[PDB]
């Protein structure tokens, strides 16, 4: 296209032959707008405002100053394919992503821009509808190509389709609702150029779902995972466990990460297929980011984060852009547990000892692949990749089970909500997950099994876990739950949890807690 | 869905 230059690196996009934009911006959002209603209409973000905002939307440069002092020889860098998959993404957000990539990516290093319709049902996206998308693409460069999935396959199914169509040596995956900062692709290509085993991910920034403001700081560089099988950014007490030379790293140095946030990463195409690509039995939205990350490290790969590659992302708030089956997320977590070896016992209990159809036949074929590849163990992963975790070995979970007081013959009970912010009760013991708690010794945390983010407090309530003395309990040899700071013990006198002076002679402050002596091998549940 | 860091 014509009109290229700074800020419009592929030329002026989306312009009819008459010099007029092919897209009419909506009027300003109505003054009387109930944000909860609008967040639930646009699928987790204010669509009224998005439809009013320009597609060539200027974004603040979120990169640190030292990142802008770096130079790249675009002739020596390999070209890449950008892959944006989407299911029923609105026109404004999807095309703003396209314009942002085209305007912000030098053409010398962008082989193509693949758009994958994961079986969308919206009229503007359908080939039996109003044909808005196809028509507007004619006003974009030919690098942009639209491929379509006959039926909604899911994230893994759509990404694999785009990767298998990409023709560049390197590919980069991006969500359909993003805005890039300057020189976002160049630092990633340089990393993969020097080692095809490196999978490099940008640092994710924020676009407020309600106001669409750009927020510096989304998902940092170093992130681990929760035993609910979920990516989780390093916390303070965890970054403190890092080697002293890695706690305040340089703004430009690349940092390894045990896990990725998902769907914003770049990789060498050939290595991606040799290291397992994706497990295509994953369904819809899910935890493919953790299955990839574990397998990546264990099978001879390196996951790192490029602090100088920043991309803005709309984190959905108060709504969801699509509806996925309820059993899909459970299945993806079961398949992910193949790579966790004995540690899968803890994850299985945290997600509720589920018993679904995790496609056992397919997973066996990947256990073989894992063996023929020589992949390393999850113990190795924890002791070498994520050694800063609160549970490096299952011996860090000494107790898992009911917390019973034999004097009153009752067990602690999360009362129907392992979520933080509610009081814990005392109820007759019944042997359900609502009355099973776990202990993490590295941090002194007493949590319900179904949420490792919920920590018991001397207030008798659960609150968000923090690696501080505000949540450090000691389980004495006498059976007392002692709070370290206050040096008081937890009592069940009067069927009301209270803190009292420690006294092993007081039966109301003596608790029993089942020891967690897991097996050495996790046997998957029968289907 | 994915959530930002605190
Ligand atoms: O069945 C699906 C679900 C999602 N997506 C796309 O995959 C990306 C990641 O999904 P989402 O943004 O909902 O994940 P989140 O960032 O909310 O965790 C988005 O571009 C979605 O449109 C897709 O192509 N098919
Ligand atoms: C986002 O917030 C949720 C809250 O339950 C989890 O803590 C999740 O681990 C967070 N994700 C990241 C990237 O830290
Ligand atoms: Mn997203
Ligand atoms: Mn945390």
Residue numbers in the entry:
A (entry chain A): 102 to 628
B (entry chain B): 1 to 6
Show me the paper's own sentences about this structure:
O-glycosylation of the protein CST1 by the mucin-type O-glycosyltransferase T. gondii (Txg) GalNAc-T3 influences cyst wall rigidity and stability. The strict glycopeptide-preferring enzyme TxgGalNAc-T3 then adds GalNAc to acceptor Thr one position N-terminal to existing Thr-O-GalNAcs and is predicted to sequentially O-glycosylate Thr rich repeats within the mucin domain of CST1. The structures reveal a unique GalNAc binding pocket that dictates the substrate preference of TxgGalNAc-T3, which is coupled to a 2nd metal binding site that is strictly conserved among apicomplexan homologs.
To investigate the basis of the substrate specificity and function of TxgGalNAc-T3, we solved the x-ray co-crystal structures of TxgGalNAc-T3 in complex with Mn2+, a non-hydrolysable form of UDP-GalNAc (UDP-2-(acetylamino)−4-F-D-galactosamine disodium salt, UDP-GalNAc-F) and each of the following glycopeptides: CST1.4, Muc5AC-3,13, Muc5AC-3, Muc5AC-13, and SRS13.2 from 2.2-2.9 Å resolution. Although the glycopeptide amino acid sequences vary, both CST1.4 and Muc5AC-3,13 are similarly bound along the active site substrate groove with the acceptor Thr positioned for catalysis, adopting a similar conformation seen in peptides bound to metazoan GalNAc-Ts. Poor electron density for the remaining unmodeled residues in CST1.4 and Muc5AC-3,13 suggests that they are disordered in the structure and making transient interactions with TxgGalNAc-T3. We could not model the peptide substrate in the structure containing Muc5AC-13 due to unresolvable electron density, and we only observe weak density for Thr-O-GalNAc in the SRS13.2 structure. It is notable that the di-glycopeptides were the only substrates with electron density for the N-terminal portion of the peptide chain, but it is not clear what is stabilizing the peptide conformations in these structures since we did not observe density for the C-terminal residues. We observed density that appears to be a 2nd metal (Mn2+N) near the GalNAc binding pocket, a striking and unexpected feature not previously seen in metazoan GalNAc-Ts. Mn2+N is coupled to the GalNAc binding pocket through coordination to His333 and indirect coordination to Glu554 via water. Glu336 and 2 additional waters complete the coordination sphere of Mn2+N, which adopts an irregular octahedral geometry. Loop II flexibility and the interaction that occurs between the Gly319 backbone carbonyl and an amide group on both di-glycopeptide substrates (Muc5AC-3,13 and CST1.4) allows TxgGalNAc-T3 to accommodate and modify substrates with variable sequences.
